[PDB]
Amino acid sequence: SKFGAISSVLNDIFSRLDPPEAEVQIDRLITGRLQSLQTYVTQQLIRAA
Amino acid sequence: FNATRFASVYAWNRKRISNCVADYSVLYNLAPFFTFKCYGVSPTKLND
């Protein structure tokens, strides 16, 4: 999933756009990949109860 | 770029680029190419 960015591949973005314009799509992917993992840990702690 | 006759807005010419090798370092020292104000790609990332 891209979460509204250009592509879901990281090496496309790091070798496609600018050294300081790719850091708003990478920061968009990171704030969804750290949210999906947080939701997974939260649901695992719910199931562990 | 060194072509004499160009086109207008209502009759904008088409020109596709086929199987080739892109050398964009030569394209900057020529007299036409000055500006690259755009998004989607980068001028330094066209060589990769």
Next chain:
Amino acid sequence: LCFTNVYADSFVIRGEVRQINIDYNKLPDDFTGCVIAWN
């Protein structure tokens, strides 16, 4: 604002202006500092 050190340079180029042809000896849009330009 108070800063530690401030430095100034001197160079004349055609305006080339998209950088500051010049990995060719580079300042990005996130580098701290400013720039001065006149004719």
